[PDB]
Design a protein around this ligand. Structure first.
Ligand SMILES: [Mn+2]
Lengths: 548, 18
């Protein structure tokens, strides 16, 4: 590309943000390489967890900063200036030198973080100081670069602490910092599948702890161990990643091929529940409780594709599986992803308006129907409407899949989605020259990642014109008081914002370096515990949605 | 634990939620 002052000014927004984070996100009380998770944009101070007793702790949670690591390494790629990547190394090396448990687990995640001012460990949730991830997708290749031994031990410790049962693959969410490390964790032999295909859509009963928003990080980690580490150190890891990934595929709906959210249901192990609102899985499968009376055998938890279950399948885990297919040059991973996306959208997508219907994996829709009773999926009277996400999240996997396997039905779905997002016309196939909307005013980071994929696909410079105009609007709307904010009324900025990565990926593409930047994988973080007066609280709301 | 909670999809209250 012929580069312009406007392109440079977007890189300078990102450089300003980085400078702000590295300054304002450092404690004045005790200065170390650690970073704050978030910055108050009025005071310029790092954000705080407030405990019920009123004590405050400044938050440093390395699980919520992986996207900032990716922006630092991206900035060194696009600028050819090594100082950004070197500062990412400095932060990372200090964290890994100091804040790993004896068993190899990091002190980070949903229920653990480091006090930025005192360097003490913090447990936002009383009596639950545990290791918790949930579609976090850490920046493994860079962590491996900084400290390969600690990164190998981490992945082995993550599997060892969260896999409760090596035959059912029940996965606990709350990993113990007292669990013993086992260097030979992946040397266990691969067991048979529990999935009996002639019984689907009914699935095997175990503890039912096989949700894809637990399985996906485990699969990702095992495959990155295989990819990154020597043979001997990584023995067994790709096989165990493959087994776990395959269990989801084996449990797909036997008539529609639609993907599922999990591959086992919870046994009814205790009785009685206190009421319909008591949704502990020990009372049995929650979908069968809430929907079973009207819907029958389809009503089991893995077959529910609404209430954001579809997002974890067709967005988060789809991006991971596509990334692994491409990394490993693995056509079987690829065809299975493509088949899953196609079979989901044939049942759920409405091409007249671009919406996604709330469905079960056999195609039964509950669109518009008030829930008949309370339960895990909502109170009685809740209504699920067909949804069209605010931004092009669901588009990105369809474009990445197309770039790997040119299926014309993926192309038709992407053209229809972009049409309803206001992009204009991609045209009838990937050889068309598109007619794109250069005044599109609702833009997001997903606009830029998607436009870049379509440029890599089609080589049509129109997509770069479109992305440049969108990126200028993105900076104009979200770069506010020196940080990136989803709404200019918000008080507190998270340093895990993805606008910087999206902006730098576009800059890389203008400089012919796209392949060199960390790919966006949809990982994100949160902290959950008791916040001031509120028992069941997330930083997402208690901090990052506060208004100035 | 000791305050029991789920980890369902859609539970963490992102700004993207309707
Ligand atoms: Mn938890």
């Amino acid at each position: 590309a012929d580069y312009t002052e406007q392109d440079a000014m977007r890189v300078q927004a990102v450089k300003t943000y980085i400078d702000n984070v590295l300054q304002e996100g450092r404690s004045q009380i005790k200065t170390t390489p650690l970073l704050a998770d978030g910055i108050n944009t009025t005071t310029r101070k790092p954000v705080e967890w407030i405990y019920p007793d009123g004590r405050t702790a400044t938050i440093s949670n390395f699980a919520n900063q992986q996207n900032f690591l990716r922006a630092l390494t991206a900035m060194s790629v696009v600028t050819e200036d090594q100082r950004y990547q070197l500062e990412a190394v400095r932060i990372t090396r200090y964290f890994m030198d100091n804040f790993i448990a004896d068993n190899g687990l990091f002190y980070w995640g949903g229920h653990r973080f480091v006090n930025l001012d005192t360097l003490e460990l913090e447990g936002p949730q009383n009596k639950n100081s545990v290791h918790e991830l949930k579609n976090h997708y850490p920046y493994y290749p860079f962590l491996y670069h900084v400290d390969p031994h600690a990164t190998e031990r981490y992945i082995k410790a993550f599997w060892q602490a969260h896999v409760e049962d090596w035959q059912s693959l029940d996965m606990g969410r709350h990993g113990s910092y007292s669990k013993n490390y086992d260097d030979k964790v992946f040397h266990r032999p691969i067991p048979a599948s529990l999935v009996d295909q002639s019984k689907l859509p009914i699935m095997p009963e175990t503890k039912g702890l096989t949700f894809i928003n637990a399985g996906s990080d485990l699969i990702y980690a095992a495959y990155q161990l295989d990819w990154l580490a020597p043979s001997a150190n990584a023995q067994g890891s790709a096989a165990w990643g493959q087994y776990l990934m395959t269990q989801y595929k084996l449990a797909k709906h036997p008539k529609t091929g639609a993907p599922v959210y999990q591959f086992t249901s919870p046994k009814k192990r205790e009785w009685p529940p206190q009421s319909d609102k008591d949704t502990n899985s020990k009372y049995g499968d929650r979908a069968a409780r809430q929907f079973g009376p009207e819907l029958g055998n389809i009503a089991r938890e893995g077959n529910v594709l609404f209430k954001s279950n579809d997002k974890s399948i067709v967005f988060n885990n789809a991006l991971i599986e596509l990334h692994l297919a491409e990394q490993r040059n693995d056509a079987a991973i690829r065809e299975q992803v493509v088949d899953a996306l196609l079979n989901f959208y044939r049942l759920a997508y409405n091409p007249e308006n671009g919406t996604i219907k709330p469905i079960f994996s056999d195609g039964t829709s509950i669109e518009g129907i008030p829930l008949a009773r309370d339960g895990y999926y909502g109170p009685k009277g809740r209504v699920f409407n067909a949804h069209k996400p605010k931004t092009e999240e669901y588009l990105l996997p369809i474009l990445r899949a197309y770039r790997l396997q040119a299926d014309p039905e993926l192309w038709q779905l992407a053209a229809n989605m972009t049409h309803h997002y206001g992009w204009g016309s991609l045209g009838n196939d990937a050889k068309a020259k598109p007619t794109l909307n250069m005044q599109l005013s609702s833009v997001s980071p997903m606009t830029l990642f998607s436009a870049i994929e379509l440029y890599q696909i089609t080589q049509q410079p129109e997509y770069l014109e479109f992305a440049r105009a969108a990126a200028d609007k993105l900076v104009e709307k979200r770069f506010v008081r020196g940080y990136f904010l989803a709404n200019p009324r918000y008080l507190n900025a998270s340093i895990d914002a993805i606008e910087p990565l999206a902006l730098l990926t576009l800059d890389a593409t203008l400089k012919g370096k796209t392949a060199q930047v960390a790919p966006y994988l949809s990982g994100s973080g949160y902290i959950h515990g008791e916040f001031a007066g509120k028992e069941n609280a997330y930083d997402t709301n208690e901090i990052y949605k506060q208004t100035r | 634990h000791h305050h029991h909670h789920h980890h369902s999809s859609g539970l963490v209250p992102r700004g993207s939620h309707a």
